[PDB]
Amino acid sequence: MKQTYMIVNELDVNKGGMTTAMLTRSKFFLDNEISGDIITFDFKANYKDILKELVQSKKMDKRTQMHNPFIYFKNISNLQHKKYNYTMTRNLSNLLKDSVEIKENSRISRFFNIMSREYLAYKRETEQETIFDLFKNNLRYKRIYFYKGKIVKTEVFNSDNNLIAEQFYDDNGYLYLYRQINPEKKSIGKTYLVCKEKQFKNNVEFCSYFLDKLIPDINDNIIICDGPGSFPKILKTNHKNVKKFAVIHVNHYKNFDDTGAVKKQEDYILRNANKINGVVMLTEAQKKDIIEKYKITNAYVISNFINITDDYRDKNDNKVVGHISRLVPQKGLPYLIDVAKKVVEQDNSVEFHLYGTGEEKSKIENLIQESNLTNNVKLLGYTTNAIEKIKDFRCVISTSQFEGQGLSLIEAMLLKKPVVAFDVKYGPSDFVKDGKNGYLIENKDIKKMANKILKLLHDKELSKSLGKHGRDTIIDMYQPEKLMVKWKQLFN
Ligand SMILES: O=P(O)(O)OC[C@@H](O)[C@@H](O)[C@@H](O)COP(=O)(O)OC[C@@H](O)[C@@H](O)[C@@H](O)COP(=O)(O)O
């Protein structure tokens, strides 16, 4: 049967967006006898520890594997030697051979050659990590990295101490990879593979070659590009039999813009749409605006699997409005404090709870101070247990000006809760049924959002009845077996 290779630049912990969605997608795929392997392109010396924590935290599937061009070309370079080459290590043992070791503490140390009458290098020693910074006239020109007893990587610097080149070593202590890095532009340039004895113009070229070397061109092996900046590496491949679909996650338009502009990264993925086997997106509304901005015929509509099956008995009848989302501009919290100003104007017993951490903490604190809704509108901060404090809220307001699918609300609905959400660009219009499960209010209409939010708070039954429909509405639209069937229809 057919095997999948999802694509993104990096994978780590504390990443809860694209990564979570890609990793969730893999789980369902394996259950439908299709492999959901990930492809990354960055160098992590400890990439093995990061992958094990994700599996242990039940965020990654044991069956999901990760392909990386540092791991791949190391395992191939490892084959061409038998013994460990301590050449680099001894070259360093030879640079510091006759130098005084000034141990500043248990971690920091400096080497001084009496004959050279100048400090030669610095040593930072920690648990399983030892770094060497080498100098010439008190100017850093090199950095030697050690991890698990062996040299893993060396970094070369210039006069301005800016990174000019990186070198990657295999498990037999040999140079298998190295690249040029533009000093000021901090951009990856001329990449040189050693075991292939090949030269790549940029990282994009190298990674295309890495995909050609990893994914065997065949009708079965399908490539799903999820990372927007990862697409050039997938568009410029030599595969002729391997299928390639792109997925637009967030809203494609340039955020908080009225000029009809589209984010550069996401603009390029849609202009080369023809070259791909199809450009898939979460909402049907985006399939229209995409056939408007790019007149595409390959655009498909498949939603990101909903991993929420929460069933509970809501009895907490308290006048409280909840908004669990990061404090990013796209959430438009300033509208939420306008809605709160009109809500607390009629009913002074209505409390506003905002949960999350981000770039607008001081913006909201000065906004809450204005109008003096201090005890009413409060910030609860980051919380692991979202469901528990959500179960307590009477209703969930979304003042977000743009969104991908409205995951924040799709979750509040699954927690049988009413939702007064602003009609968003590819947002609530897809699930929020005005009067049936919530209140889709036209954007920038505080007054319309306020009176409706008050109506939910002033009707213990209506709010519970609307919310009861909410969970059933989401379960009905977003069905795994048919979502998987939509995926299968693209693969077949
Ligand atoms: O041209 P290159 O030199 O090869 O590299 C420059 C390139 O333009 C960058 O690598 C891209 O910004 C990164 O590409 P991606 O968009 O595929 O990276 C994914 C992104 O970093 C994303 O934020 C990540 O998956 C984790 O997100 P989350 O924490 O929301 O789940």
Short mmCIF file of all heavy atoms in Angstrom, two decimals, residues 138 179 424, unseen atoms left out:
data_model
loop_
_atom_site.label_atom_id
_atom_site.label_comp_id
_atom_site.label_asym_id
_atom_site.label_seq_id
_atom_site.Cartn_x
_atom_site.Cartn_y
_atom_site.Cartn_z
N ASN A 138 42.54 37.93 19.70
CA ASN A 138 41.31 38.16 20.49
C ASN A 138 40.10 38.28 19.55
O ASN A 138 39.16 39.03 19.88
CB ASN A 138 41.47 39.38 21.40
CG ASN A 138 40.79 39.23 22.74
OD1 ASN A 138 40.50 38.12 23.17
ND2 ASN A 138 40.56 40.34 23.42
N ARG A 179 28.81 24.03 4.58
CA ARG A 179 28.10 25.03 3.75
C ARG A 179 28.61 26.44 4.01
O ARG A 179 29.12 26.72 5.10
CB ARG A 179 26.59 24.96 3.94
CG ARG A 179 26.09 25.00 5.39
CD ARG A 179 24.63 24.58 5.42
NE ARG A 179 24.08 24.43 6.76
CZ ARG A 179 22.80 24.19 7.03
NH1 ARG A 179 21.92 24.07 6.05
NH2 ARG A 179 22.40 24.06 8.29
N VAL A 424 -15.35 35.59 10.36
CA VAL A 424 -13.89 35.77 10.10
C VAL A 424 -13.58 35.39 8.65
O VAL A 424 -14.42 34.72 8.02
CB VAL A 424 -13.04 34.93 11.07
#
